[PDB]
Amino acid sequence: GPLGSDHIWEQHTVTLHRAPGFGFGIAISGGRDNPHFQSGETSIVISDVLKGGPAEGQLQENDRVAMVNGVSMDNVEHAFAVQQLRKSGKNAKITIRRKK
């Protein structure tokens, strides 16, 4: 979706049950306190996904993460964020939004 004269985004939260092989299912990417950042976003995003777990086809670059396990991901470092979902063990929910 390069352009649809709409640009409507929606927020959806899903619970990812940790499974053998990886767990989270997706790879965190971004961080507010990272080497490179952009003023006006500071939102974490998924770098890459294994495509073989609970988040195989749910969390991707197409969808920008806003909150994880209740914690906001629009002003935190990738480490602080990943450590939050990592604590789950078998119930890591992430809130993402997309428009296309």
**How far apart, in Å, are the Cα atoms of 33 and each of 22, 36, 59, 61?**
25, 8, 22, 20
CATH domain 1-100 topology = Pdz3 Domain (2.30.42)
Question: For the chain, what are the domain ranges?
Answer: 1-100
Are the C-beta atoms of 90 and 98 separated by less than 8 Å? Answer: no
CA pair distance 72, 74, nearest whole angstrom:
6
Separation of first and last alpha carbons in the chain: 5
